[PDB]
Amino acid sequence: AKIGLFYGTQTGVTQTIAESIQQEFGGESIVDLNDIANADASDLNAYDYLIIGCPTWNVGELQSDWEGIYDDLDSVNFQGKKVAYFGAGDQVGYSDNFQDAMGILEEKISSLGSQTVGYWPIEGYDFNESKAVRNNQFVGLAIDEDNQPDLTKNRIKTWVSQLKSEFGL
Numbered sequence: 001a002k003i004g005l006f007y008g009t010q011t012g013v014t015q016t017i018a019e020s021i022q023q024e025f026g027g028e029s030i031v032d033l034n035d036i037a038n039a040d041a042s043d044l045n046a047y048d049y050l051i052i053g054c055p056t057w058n059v060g061e062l063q064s065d066w067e068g069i070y071d072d073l074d075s076v077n078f079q080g081k082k083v084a085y086f087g088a089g090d091q092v093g094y095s096d097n098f099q100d101a102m103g104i105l106e107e108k109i110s111s112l113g114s115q116t117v118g119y120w121p122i123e124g125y126d127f128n129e130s131k132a133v134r135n136n137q138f139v140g141l142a143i144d145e146d147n148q149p150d151l152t153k154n155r156i157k158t159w160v161s162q163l164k165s166e167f168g169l
C-alpha cells in the first residue's frame, strides 16, 4: 500500500478511529495500519503519503508512544511527503488544550519538509484554544468521542473523501 497510517493510543479510541479510516479508504490494500508503539521512526521513510493519529492527554501532552519517538523524528526525511493528521480529544473537559497533540506533531513534521493536507473546518466545535488550528481550520480531523460520538462516522467519511484526491486516489 502506498499510504501508511501510524497511530498511538492510551484507551483505544484513536485505534478505533484509525481502523475506520483504513476501512473508509478501501481496506488493507490501500492503507497500512501501524501502532507507533511497534514502530521505529525509520519506518516512516517508506511512504510518500502518511496519516498520523494521536490523542491529546494530560492537559496538552502527546500520547506516550508518540512522546517516546518524538526526538527520533528528525532522522526521517520528510521532504516531499504529504502528511494528513487525526486526533481524539475532549473539547469540554480540555477546552484550552483541545487536540494539542495533533498540533504539536504537525508543527514538528511540517518543519521537516512535508506538506500538510487534510485541513478540517472548525464549525460544530466549541473550545477556547488549540495548537492544532491554522487559518481558522484544524490541521487535521478532530474527533471527540467523549462529547460528540454521534458526529464521528460522518466526520471520518467526509474527511477521507477529501483526502483521496490529495493522495492520488
Ligand SMILES: Cc1cc2nc3c(=O)[nH]c(=O)nc-3n(C[C@H](O)[C@H](O)[C@H](O)COP(=O)(O)O)c2cc1C
Residues within 6 Å of the ligand: 008, 009, 010, 011, 012, 013, 014, 015, 055, 056, 057, 058, 059, 060, 061, 063, 088, 089, 090, 091, 094, 097, 098, 099, 100, 145, 146
Ligand atoms: C486525564 C485526561 C486528560 C486529557 N487531556 C486532554 C487534553 O489535554 N486535550 C484534549 O483534547 N483531550 C484530552 N483528553 C481526552 C482524550 O484525548 C480522549 O478521551 C481520547 O478519546 C483518548 O484517546 P485514546 O483512547 O486514543 O488515548 C484527556 C483525557 C483524560 C482522561
